[PDB]
Amino acid sequence: VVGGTRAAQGEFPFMVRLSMGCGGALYAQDIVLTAAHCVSGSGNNTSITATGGVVDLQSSSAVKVRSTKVLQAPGFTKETYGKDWALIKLAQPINQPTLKIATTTAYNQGTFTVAGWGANREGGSQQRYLLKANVPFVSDAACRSSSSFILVANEMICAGYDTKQEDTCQGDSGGPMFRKDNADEWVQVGIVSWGEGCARKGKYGVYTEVSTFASAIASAARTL
Amino acid sequence: VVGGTRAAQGEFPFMVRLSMGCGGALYAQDIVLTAAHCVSGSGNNTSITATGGVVDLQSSSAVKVRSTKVLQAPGFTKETYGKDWALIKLAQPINQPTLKIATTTAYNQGTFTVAGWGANREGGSQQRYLLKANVPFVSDAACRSSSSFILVANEMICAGYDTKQEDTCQGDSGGPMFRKDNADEWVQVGIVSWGEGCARKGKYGVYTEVSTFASAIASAARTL
Numbered sequence A, B: 001v002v003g004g005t006r007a008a009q010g011e012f013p014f015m016v017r018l019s020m021g022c023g024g025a026l027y028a029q030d031i032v033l034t035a036a037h038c039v040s041g042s043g044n045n046t047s048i049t050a051t052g053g054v055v056d057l058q059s060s061s062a063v064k065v066r067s068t069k070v071l072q073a074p075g076f077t078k079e080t081y082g083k084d085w086a087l088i089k090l091a092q093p094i095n096q097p098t099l100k101i102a103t104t105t106a107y108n109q110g111t112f113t114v115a116g117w118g119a120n121r122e123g124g125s126q127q128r129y130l131l132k133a134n135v136p137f138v139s140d141a142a143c144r145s146s147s148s149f150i151l152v153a154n155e156m157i158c159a160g161y162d163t164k165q166e167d168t169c170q171g172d173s174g175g176p177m178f179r180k181d182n183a184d185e186w187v188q189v190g191i192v193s194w195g196e197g198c199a200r201k202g203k204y205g206v207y208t209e210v211s212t213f214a215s216a217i218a219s220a221a222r223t224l
C-alpha cells in the first residue's frame, strides 16, 4: 500500500498473508479468496502457507496453515483480461471472522478501504505490518479513459486518486477491497488485481468486480 | 527480455514456460529448475502447467504437462535475500535435452545468454514468442555498489549493461542464464531473480549463483 498507515491488531481480522507474496481474505474459516494471478492454476496444492490472526507477520500469535487445494477462476488468462479470482482451501480453519462478499451491485460505489503487506512505493519491499488506505470509486468510463490495457467493464472495478499518492501496489494483490454495507458490516467489493505502476499520476487501481463473480465463487467453494 | 530478438524454434530446447508467469529450465526431463520466488513453498502441487518444446506458447506442438510437487530452496526469504531457486516435478517428461548446471565457478564470467517470455520493456505484456539476449558478467563489487537492496555475493551473480537496453524483465524470472562450458555444451550459471526496473541506467540484472547451490539442487532433486 502506497500512502498507507498501519492497521490495528484485530481491525481487519479476515486478512490473510499468502506465501507467494499476496494477500487474501477469509471467505470461510478454511477458504481464502485471493486473485487468480496469485496462483498457477487449479489442483491439489499443499505448498502455500497462509498467515492469519495478526497484523505483524513476525508475531508469535500468528496462525500459519498450509493449503490443500486451489481453484483458479475458470477461463482465467491474465489480469488485464479479467476473471482475476481464486480460492485456496486450507488444511485447518483460521479462527477469525470471515469477510462477506458482495452478491449485488449495491456497494460498487463510494469510498473503499484496502489493506495489505505489499510495497509502499513502486519497486519497494514487502511490509512486516499490515497497511491500510482509503480509495474512492472511479467509474469504468473514467478508468478506461485513463488506461492503456484493456478494461473488461463487467469484471473490473476501479478506485483511486488522480495525483494523491495513495494506492495498492505489488504484493497487495489478492487482498480485499471493502466498505460498509447497509447493515454496518464490512462487505468485499473488490480483489486487488492490477495497475499501471503504483500511485501514478492519472492512473488508478483495478480490482476484480466481486459481485459479478460471487455466484461462481460460491460454486467453486462448494468443490473444496 | 528487453533488447531481445526472437529465439529460433529448437535453439534452446531446455526452455520451459510456467503457468504463474515465470520461466524455467529443464533440469531433468521431469524436473524444472526455476526461481524460489516463482513458487509458494514446498509440497504437493498439481496446479502448475509447464509448456515445453516450443518457442511459440500458442503452438499446436506445445508440450503442456502438469506439476506434481514443488521444492522451494530451504530458508528462502526474499529475492534480494538470496537462495532464489526451486524445483518443480512434472507428471510426465518433456523429451528435450536438459540443461546441465554449473557446479564450479569456472564459467561465472564472460558473456552469458538469457531467454524468456517476459516483458520487453518496463510494464510491458508477457510475450508469445521466446526472446533471447546476451548480457556480460558484472563483478559483485560493481553490482553491490550499484544496488539499493542487499547483494549477497556468494548467492547472486550479476550481469548486464550500465546503459544499453538489454536485460531480463518481469516474467523472465526463473529462466536460466547460461553459456558454453569447455566441452562446448550449454551450462547454467544463473537463474533470473531480480533487478531494479528493467535495463535501467546504472542498474544490472541479479541472478541466482547456481554454482553455490548445485549440491543442494541435486540433493533436492534426489528426493522428488
Ligand SMILES: [Ca+2]
Residues within 6 Å of the ligand: A140, A152, A153, A154, A155, A156, A157, A158, A209
Ligand atoms: Ca466495472
Ligand SMILES: [Ca+2]
Residues within 6 Å of the ligand: B140, B152, B153, B154, B155, B156, B157, B158, B209
Ligand atoms: Ca556473486
Ligand code: NA
Residues within 6 Å of the ligand: A160, A161, A162, A163, A164, A199, A200, A201, A202, A203, A204
Ligand atoms: Na493516480
Ligand code: NA
Residues within 6 Å of the ligand: B160, B161, B162, B163, B164, B199, B200, B201, B202, B203, B204
Ligand atoms: Na543498466
